[PDB]
Design a protein around this ligand. Structure first.
Ligand code: HEM
Length: 154
């Protein structure tokens, strides 16, 4: 796939709003993911034990991880599709150390879209949501191809 420049514009325009508060957005997103698809919490040895959304909100480690994740995603989105180098180390650790199935990347992509919709309704109308969805599908597709070359397709 290939996004057009106007689509990339819609995606970086709302991403600039997220970047005003990266830790808050990282928190909302992981909490939405864990509540919606609790099985994903099992992949985190560091977080597994968290029992409630209150514990999640209070976890500093989880907040730090949210910032690490969104910063890496933001760097990939700003590449506008030329993200080969960025995706290499990411694909290697998620396929051979963490073992994150594409399915879970679909689940956080839904959590991202839900939180942007909630927080940024004015900058995240239908067209902007379509462009973000397209950018995340491109991301998933390129990572799934890398997983395959690495021997994990999963
Ligand atoms: C937008 C998608 C994602 C991006 C951009 C991303 C980014 C990162 C980065 C940059 C790290 C630290 C470096 C490394 O380990 O490679 C990390 C670690 C990790 N990610 Fe991902 N990730 C994403 C989605 C996921 C998902 C959906 C899951 C799980 C259900 C997950 C599970 C983990 C785990 C277990 C670690 C290690 C955490 C540790 O204990 O510190 N990641 N991720």
């Amino acid at each position: 796939m290939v996004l057009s420049e106007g689509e990339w514009q819609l995606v970086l325009h709302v991403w600039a709003k997220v970047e005003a508060d990266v830790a808050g957005h990282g928190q909302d997103i992981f909490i939405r993911l864990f509540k919606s698809h609790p099985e994903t919490l099992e992949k985190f040895d560091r977080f597994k034990h968290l029992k409630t959304e209150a514990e999640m909100k209070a976890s500093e480690d989880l907040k730090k991880h949210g910032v690490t994740v969104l910063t890496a995603l933001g760097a990939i989105l700003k590449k506008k599709g030329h993200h080969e180098a960025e995706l290499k180390p990411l694909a290697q650790s998620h396929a051979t150390k963490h073992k994150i199935p594409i399915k879970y990347l679909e689940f956080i992509s839904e959590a991202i879209i839900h939180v942007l919709h909630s927080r940024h309704p004015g900058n995240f109308g239908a067209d902007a949501q379509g462009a973000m969805n397209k950018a995340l599908e491109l991301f998933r597709k390129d990572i799934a191809a890398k997983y395959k070359e690495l021997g994990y397709q999963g």
